[PDB]
């Protein structure tokens, strides 16, 4: 109801008014988001700015994860030499998965979903091959690949 | 020693173009340039022996991170592996002799130290190109050699045709640079990194190999992009030697060999068509430098087909690049000496005899010409025969036509190279200027490249030399017969009466004339429409008279 | 060559042109233009200030990527062994793939779901019930 | 705030200096723009990059006019405070000093305002100053001044009722509460598109720029190209994208086709230009079209790449205007047919012209290269063809750039002598900024 | 052979002097009348616009034609991006009520 929404707004305003934090902690780098059942979180501005700060933190952390994994994968591949085809597939897979998470989470309203492994493409090729088998016509598409890159 | 192969020619260019050179003059700047190339060549020799023979690659973080926004991460990092060591040895060794030649060839130029600094910058950006471990530092090298090629082609700026040749090289390469940039975007988007060691592609989205192939066709001057290469003869002879041997034209082939993400049908068709086209183009030219330019285009076609054949074909492609640089630079330096001995004339109808040149210039032209035509047990014999035999056993039916085109091209090459020797020395004299050059510096510059030609026979480029791909004696010894056929035809000096074919080929199939009006004049006219009819017309809002 | 050799003296003394078109008057030192002290003070104090911003600010204060680099490393440490255990447990993997199907993800995106346990949508969806209740349990036995 | 009042009051004291003390007038007006550069550098020192998005806030009660700093505003403010003393070195009268001082106050306060009505009040209070600057009596053009003022007024008058519509809808024009309320986004989105598509030159409302940016003096051209176009971009990034995002998604095909046709048609027009200043003036439209499409992609790190392209353009194109201004000041023409062989007669000026030509064409070791790569990463992530259109048309930019350079720099040597110390030091901060931001921009 | 500086600096204007002083306008170009006329005409080329046959035809096929091509390409790219992101059909301007703005709390 309107009364319950109003009392919740008053509680949120009181909490964010009397808020403090010290000892090496930055406010606007919060540890946890504020969990809510609100229709349109922008109904409560303090919760919206808090979760905005948390989401900014997560995007930058995922970028950093991608860089650490890329350094590790470079070390593996350069040490392995010509044996890199069977030695460093797993670390390449983990780097590609981290890049996928760094791009596809909180992506914006317009960008398409990024597949670093050609994994959506080969999954679609599998499903289209299966559909063309039941359709009992020739497949106009390529057959799906087992792996497309050095990772996936 | 590893960073001395890349930094130090750039340092020589920085010294010879800055106001430090105001205190050295021509005499001091020549010393600075030659020493700054000798040090880089010594460093590249050490790198070559460590990486090629003992197999220990070296990765250097040079200047930290360049730029890193989101997951797009470009770093100032080098990696010195087998291909990089091969390219560095080739580039620095050719550029040292070209610097030693240019310090005497351009002696009477008024701005000599500026020319030497431009040569050093061009060499250094080539070293940056091949030493890079990711795509963006490679693009630094790509556009750096493009800019230095513009500065060196249009060096004699008071001549309008030289200025227009430099602008043409920039624009033709800018089309392929755009396609290469879009391909880099595809590669990074669907693999997640820019470093070469993390770019292992089994099955990609087609636009990747096509757009990277177009970007390589621009720099390596393949079909429908070769038009800038012939006009780049407006620059001085050291510029042409360094463009056609070690820098610029070998960069696209290096990029395709490094990445190995092409689709072989396009690569084989483009390479074989380029080889046949440049073979028939060079057979019908009379400008001494234009024949050598078209032979460069033809050999780049051979290397393109080879890297289409496979991984072994990619190794053979790199091997032919490495052996081609030495005798091509030697051919250009000998041609420059012949031109200077004949009063600046470049037409082969006004040569003849053995008075306008030194004994060493004639020996250099003879030995480099014999390596180019695949004379047995010289340097080009091993690499060219390897590519030809690999093309004779490919299981792709497309490679059947490509092999025939390559054999016809081999006969044409032995025709026009023998014609270049025959017109220059064997016929009676038909010039009027005899001023033969016998200075120490250009003779030593030629002797170094002949030593590298001997070195390629004695020590191979890779392990393919001596491997036997099992072919019958008829298939194996046919290119020798095609070489002999070219030699016999060119020394007989015979011609045909089909003058319309002669003038269709000699005018180089009309590519420049057709390009002068199929994109160029329409671009000008569409600009007229967008300005006059749009900005001044349809969108213009007038005044209210009162 | 002058003197008959490459190794002789040079042949030019004096000004080789005039820098900025400035010619010395009566041998006097060049008079300082009106803007020069203020230009050098202003732009030099901007350049030194930009240098000190890049080289003397605390790293977390200079760029947020230095705040997140140590926090990504520990999360990656506790995620690499989760991914190691997932490669050894087929029952946990098939339960993760079931949760991936519920979240409109494909089977190859199983590694992605482990790597996004701290995301805003996953925490809020565990709170709201859009996320399946089993995913928290799978995270619990993959961390254990 | 107290500092800003002190800086304004120190700047306004130029009028009270008696005109017979020429040296004092020059030194005072130059120092009055040097000081805000130091203050904005200090603001960059004070900024916490791991803290909140909005820092150093101040709000002046119930008068609107609320202020705050984010990254885009801070980079643009640093660029403006660099550009204004160079403008001070190119003027000779107290009227010019006072017009540029008032313009600096208005630009600096507009770049960091957080109120839409405050943005409206602060920005187009510069209209009459631009009219007097462009239509100056002996050497300006009144037609150009009328065009720029009337186009800007038309766009602002479209915005003003929609501004007041959201103000009556929610109760405030503060952007922090406008972004959290429910508003009719189509109407306000059309008003904001109307202002910012005139400020950024987007076709068809772009015809004021070729007249105004050429008829202006060299200082006016430096200001108009390097600063005032970017107020449309910061308008997009600060006000329109946060407050009307549903509109910003729904208008994307229209904004996309406007950006594509602006890029292509303005590049095609630049090739037929015969005036050097008109050549430099057209090239800015294509760069701003790439900026606008990168802002509207909203895809990877779109605010970052688009702000970086705004900074790279704001460094490179004022230097080209400075070189054209030197040629015009000491040869009295801007016509290409009167210039040839400038390499032999101005070697330093031609070297600077070549370096800034390469920078304008987004070659590496210049900040435009990094900028265009990241902008095309942001564009590519929506669709590959929208990136391909900009990629394949790179020959068209290089054609006009190298054709203009080759026509004026090579050939028979005719034209003025090389640059003075003052002209070299007008150019020099832009070159140092370009070398830094193109080699090691970040740490 | 003018003298615009004293031996200790001190610029002199030479207002009443016979010798011509070197100054800012020393290298101003001598104007060619036909070049000035051509640049004036190109500066005022909007007076030469006329709705004849060629103007109308080229303004239709190139200006309107490429504008329509770019609008079609933009809509194509928008729809393909929404399909490759797991979205339904989305509401552009004049497209009936539909989905705009995906929710971050939702898995697509
Ligand atoms: C390369 C150079 C480019 C420009 C030169 C054009 C050469 C084309 C040509 O057919 O010349 C033959 C040409 C014969 O022409 P011709 O002597 O004027 O005419 C023949 C006589 O009138 C009378 O001669 P004949 O009747 O005694 O017979 C000669 C001729 C047959 O002559 C005929 O009667 C023609 C009838 C056609 C079918 C037989 O024989 C052949 O050509 C048979 C094939 C060998 O050969 C030469 O004398 C020139 C030799 C120079 C090298 C050419 C060797 C062949 C190269 C193969 C690669 C082709 C590259 C060109 C690509 C096309 C674009
Ligand atoms: C009420 C209008 C007042 C506001 C504008 C104003 O003050 O205009 C005065 C001013 C009066 O000048 P004028 O010396 O009487 O010359 C009248 C035109 O040049 C007439 O010259 P025209 O023969 O070329 O006019 C035919 C006109 C075709 O006229 C129209 O398209 C009229 C339809 C407008 C209704 C809106 C839809 O086609 C165009 O000029 C290009 C297509 C316009 C789009 O009007 C103009 O400058 C032209 C107005 C055209 C509007 C479109 C502007 C495109 C951007
Ligand atoms: C939208 C982000 C802003 C980026 C805009 C592009 C800037 C252009 C140049 C790129 C330089 C990158 C600098 C990175 C480190 C500097 C500090 C920093 O972190 O940047 C600041 C802002 O950076 C700046 O202001 C950079 C100034 C660049 C302007 C340079 C041009 C002016 C110089 C002209 C030439 C002077 C030469 C004088 C010498 C003679 C904040 O940005 P973010 O890290 O994104 O903010 C974090 C977000 N949050 C708080 C929510 C967590
Ligand atoms: C002068 C007294 C009256 C001024 C009233 C102004 C009302 C608005 C008129 C249109 C806006 C013009 C603003 C231009 C400001 C810059 C400028 O040029 O200032 C002037 C003087 O402008 C000022 O009045 C400056 C002080 C007012 C602003 C600063 C204080 C308040 C903030 C400098 O002197 P000159 O132009 O040489 O004066 C000669 C006058 N005439 C053009 C007629 C030949
Ligand atoms: C470690 C590197 C340190 C620097 C090394 C480079 C400096 C050596 C080259 C010196 C400048 C070359 C120009 C020169 O010396 O010109 C003379 C050429 O000098 C030579 O004899 C050739 C140069 C020395 C040999 C080549 C050295 C280059 C290094 C590569 C060696 C590779 C083998 C001109 O002839 P001349 O002076 O001998 O005769 C004078 C004339 O007849 C009367 O006017
Ligand atoms: C009508 C008057 C003219 C037009 C309006 C001008 C409004 C004043 C300018 C903008 C004021 C905010 C400056 C930006 C900023 O971040 O300021 C903070 C930081 O202060 C600064 O460092 C301000 C630097 C000022 C100069 C930088 C450029 C901004 C605008 C320039 C105006 C003057 C330019 C002169 C050019 C000749 C606020 O400090 P504070 O202590 O007042 O606030 C803290 C707290 O909330 C208490 O209120
Ligand atoms: C108009 C165009 C002109 C073109 C010019 C040539 C083409 C240039 C193309 C690339 C330009 C890149 C220049 C980068 C400048 C410095 C960037 C790094 C700044 C910095 O603090 O880094 C440290 C500086 O180290 C060092 O710098 C090394 C320490 C000193 C020892 C060597 C001294 C240099 C000798 C160079 C000779 C001449 C070479 C000419 C290029 C290295 O450490 P890091 O923080 O990155 O840590 C990682 C590894 N430790
Ligand atoms: C006079 C003009 C004749 C043109 C042909 C070149 C001379 C070849 C003489 C000949 O009949 O040799 C045959 C080569 O044919 C073959 O089986 C090889 C056909 C292709 C050879 C083309 C290259 C020839 C070398 C130059 C027989 O060969 P054989 O029984 O003597 O062979 C085994 C011993 N080595
Ligand atoms: C003198 C310049 C020496 C090189 C300075 C340099 O490259 O620093 C960059 C910032 O540039 C600057 O700080 C340049 C400011 C001065 C303009 C040019 C003089 C990046 O700094 P870094 O990568 O060395 O920083 C690592 C610590 N976080
Ligand atoms: C700038 C120029 C850049 C372009 C350079 C060359 C590109 C050539 C592209 C040729 C093909 C373009 C794409 C068309 C086929 C794909 C089709 O996607 O679907 C269309 C697109 C996609 O349909 P959906 O994906 O099923 O929604 O259809 C539409 O919704 C648009 C249909 C109407 C398009 C024309 C509208 C009239 C605009 C008139 C503009 C003229 C104003 C003049 C003012 C002066």
PDB file of N, CA and C in Angstrom, chain C residues 101-130:
ATOM      1  N   UNK C 101      20.371 -23.724 -16.932  1.00  0.00           N
ATOM      2  CA  UNK C 101      19.174 -23.806 -17.765  1.00  0.00           C
ATOM      3  C   UNK C 101      18.047 -22.957 -17.195  1.00  0.00           C
ATOM      4  N   UNK C 102      17.909 -22.935 -15.868  1.00  0.00           N
ATOM      5  CA  UNK C 102      16.892 -22.084 -15.259  1.00  0.00           C
ATOM      6  C   UNK C 102      17.198 -20.596 -15.428  1.00  0.00           C
ATOM      7  N   UNK C 103      18.469 -20.232 -15.594  1.00  0.00           N
ATOM      8  CA  UNK C 103      18.877 -18.839 -15.711  1.00  0.00           C
ATOM      9  C   UNK C 103      19.133 -18.424 -17.156  1.00  0.00           C
ATOM     10  N   UNK C 104      18.556 -19.152 -18.118  1.00  0.00           N
ATOM     11  CA  UNK C 104      18.678 -18.891 -19.559  1.00  0.00           C
ATOM     12  C   UNK C 104      20.134 -18.875 -20.013  1.00  0.00           C
ATOM     13  N   UNK C 105      20.933 -19.777 -19.460  1.00  0.00           N
ATOM     14  CA  UNK C 105      22.323 -19.929 -19.847  1.00  0.00           C
ATOM     15  C   UNK C 105      22.532 -21.322 -20.414  1.00  0.00           C
ATOM     16  N   UNK C 106      23.605 -21.470 -21.176  1.00  0.00           N
ATOM     17  CA  UNK C 106      23.909 -22.710 -21.843  1.00  0.00           C
ATOM     18  C   UNK C 106      24.936 -23.475 -21.019  1.00  0.00           C
ATOM     19  N   UNK C 107      25.193 -24.725 -21.418  1.00  0.00           N
ATOM     20  CA  UNK C 107      26.043 -25.633 -20.649  1.00  0.00           C
ATOM     21  C   UNK C 107      27.486 -25.138 -20.570  1.00  0.00           C
ATOM     22  N   UNK C 108      27.984 -24.503 -21.636  1.00  0.00           N
ATOM     23  CA  UNK C 108      29.335 -23.948 -21.612  1.00  0.00           C
ATOM     24  C   UNK C 108      29.481 -22.776 -20.647  1.00  0.00           C
ATOM     25  N   UNK C 109      28.378 -22.173 -20.211  1.00  0.00           N
ATOM     26  CA  UNK C 109      28.400 -21.069 -19.267  1.00  0.00           C
ATOM     27  C   UNK C 109      28.333 -21.536 -17.812  1.00  0.00           C
ATOM     28  N   UNK C 110      28.813 -22.745 -17.521  1.00  0.00           N
ATOM     29  CA  UNK C 110      28.857 -23.222 -16.141  1.00  0.00           C
ATOM     30  C   UNK C 110      29.992 -22.565 -15.363  1.00  0.00           C
ATOM     31  N   UNK C 111      31.145 -22.368 -16.014  1.00  0.00           N
ATOM     32  CA  UNK C 111      32.267 -21.679 -15.380  1.00  0.00           C
ATOM     33  C   UNK C 111      31.915 -20.233 -15.076  1.00  0.00           C
ATOM     34  N   UNK C 112      31.120 -19.613 -15.952  1.00  0.00           N
ATOM     35  CA  UNK C 112      30.694 -18.234 -15.765  1.00  0.00           C
ATOM     36  C   UNK C 112      29.864 -18.069 -14.507  1.00  0.00           C
ATOM     37  N   UNK C 113      28.980 -19.030 -14.221  1.00  0.00           N
ATOM     38  CA  UNK C 113      28.085 -18.931 -13.070  1.00  0.00           C
ATOM     39  C   UNK C 113      28.828 -19.003 -11.743  1.00  0.00           C
ATOM     40  N   UNK C 114      29.903 -19.787 -11.677  1.00  0.00           N
ATOM     41  CA  UNK C 114      30.758 -19.805 -10.496  1.00  0.00           C
ATOM     42  C   UNK C 114      31.443 -18.457 -10.318  1.00  0.00           C
ATOM     43  N   UNK C 115      31.913 -17.874 -11.415  1.00  0.00           N
ATOM     44  CA  UNK C 115      32.644 -16.618 -11.414  1.00  0.00           C
ATOM     45  C   UNK C 115      31.760 -15.408 -11.141  1.00  0.00           C
ATOM     46  N   UNK C 116      30.437 -15.568 -11.099  1.00  0.00           N
ATOM     47  CA  UNK C 116      29.530 -14.464 -10.816  1.00  0.00           C
ATOM     48  C   UNK C 116      28.722 -14.677  -9.534  1.00  0.00           C
ATOM     49  N   UNK C 117      29.314 -15.335  -8.536  1.00  0.00           N
ATOM     50  CA  UNK C 117      28.634 -15.536  -7.260  1.00  0.00           C
ATOM     51  C   UNK C 117      28.511 -14.259  -6.435  1.00  0.00           C
ATOM     52  N   UNK C 118      29.307 -13.230  -6.722  1.00  0.00           N
ATOM     53  CA  UNK C 118      29.251 -11.975  -5.983  1.00  0.00           C
ATOM     54  C   UNK C 118      28.538 -10.865  -6.742  1.00  0.00           C
ATOM     55  N   UNK C 119      27.916 -11.172  -7.873  1.00  0.00           N
ATOM     56  CA  UNK C 119      27.287 -10.139  -8.678  1.00  0.00           C
ATOM     57  C   UNK C 119      25.989  -9.665  -8.039  1.00  0.00           C
ATOM     58  N   UNK C 120      25.591  -8.450  -8.422  1.00  0.00           N
ATOM     59  CA  UNK C 120      24.398  -7.818  -7.871  1.00  0.00           C
ATOM     60  C   UNK C 120      23.135  -8.595  -8.228  1.00  0.00           C
ATOM     61  N   UNK C 121      23.049  -9.086  -9.468  1.00  0.00           N
ATOM     62  CA  UNK C 121      21.856  -9.805  -9.901  1.00  0.00           C
ATOM     63  C   UNK C 121      21.732 -11.153  -9.200  1.00  0.00           C
ATOM     64  N   UNK C 122      22.854 -11.823  -8.933  1.00  0.00           N
ATOM     65  CA  UNK C 122      22.805 -13.129  -8.283  1.00  0.00           C
ATOM     66  C   UNK C 122      22.412 -12.995  -6.815  1.00  0.00           C
ATOM     67  N   UNK C 123      22.976 -12.013  -6.105  1.00  0.00           N
ATOM     68  CA  UNK C 123      22.599 -11.796  -4.710  1.00  0.00           C
ATOM     69  C   UNK C 123      21.148 -11.344  -4.582  1.00  0.00           C
ATOM     70  N   UNK C 124      20.724 -10.397  -5.423  1.00  0.00           N
ATOM     71  CA  UNK C 124      19.339  -9.944  -5.368  1.00  0.00           C
ATOM     72  C   UNK C 124      18.367 -11.019  -5.841  1.00  0.00           C
ATOM     73  N   UNK C 125      18.783 -11.895  -6.762  1.00  0.00           N
ATOM     74  CA  UNK C 125      17.915 -12.968  -7.208  1.00  0.00           C
ATOM     75  C   UNK C 125      17.826 -14.123  -6.240  1.00  0.00           C
ATOM     76  N   UNK C 126      18.899 -14.379  -5.490  1.00  0.00           N
ATOM     77  CA  UNK C 126      18.807 -15.289  -4.357  1.00  0.00           C
ATOM     78  C   UNK C 126      17.862 -14.733  -3.305  1.00  0.00           C
ATOM     79  N   UNK C 127      17.879 -13.411  -3.111  1.00  0.00           N
ATOM     80  CA  UNK C 127      16.966 -12.799  -2.149  1.00  0.00           C
ATOM     81  C   UNK C 127      15.516 -12.850  -2.623  1.00  0.00           C
ATOM     82  N   UNK C 128      15.272 -12.617  -3.916  1.00  0.00           N
ATOM     83  CA  UNK C 128      13.904 -12.501  -4.415  1.00  0.00           C
ATOM     84  C   UNK C 128      13.285 -13.835  -4.808  1.00  0.00           C
ATOM     85  N   UNK C 129      14.091 -14.832  -5.145  1.00  0.00           N
ATOM     86  CA  UNK C 129      13.580 -16.111  -5.578  1.00  0.00           C
ATOM     87  C   UNK C 129      13.623 -16.351  -7.069  1.00  0.00           C
ATOM     88  N   UNK C 130      14.125 -15.396  -7.854  1.00  0.00           N
ATOM     89  CA  UNK C 130      14.335 -15.641  -9.276  1.00  0.00           C
ATOM     90  C   UNK C 130      15.437 -16.669  -9.490  1.00  0.00           C
TER      91      UNK C 130
END
